[PDB]
Write a protein that binds this ligand. Sequence first.
Ligand SMILES: *[C@@H]1O[C@H](CO)[C@@H](O)[C@H](O)[C@H]1NC(C)=O
Ligand SMILES: *[C@@H]1O[C@H](CO)[C@@H](O)[C@H](O)[C@H]1NC(C)=O
Length: 43
Amino acid sequence: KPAWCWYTLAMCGAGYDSGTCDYMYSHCFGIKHHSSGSSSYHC
Ligand SMILES: *[C@@H]1O[C@H](CO)[C@@H](O)[C@H](O)[C@H]1NC(C)=O
Ligand SMILES: *[C@@H]1O[C@H](CO)[C@@H](O)[C@H](O)[C@H]1NC(C)=O
């Protein structure tokens, strides 16, 4: 199986704001907060 997520972090080391990590990392998880819309707000 592929391996680009954690990989992007592995090379990081311990950063909290660089480029690939902050991007790939965040996206790797995410919390329904992408440019689109909430779950079910304002019926
Ligand atoms: C991101 O983390 C810090 C940025 O200050 C640095 O050590 C590192 O080189 C940057 N880039 C990557 C790929 O980690
Ligand atoms: C809004 O959606 C809910 C379902 O979660 C529904 O019960 C309700 O009738 C809809 N309209 C209003 C005014 O809440």
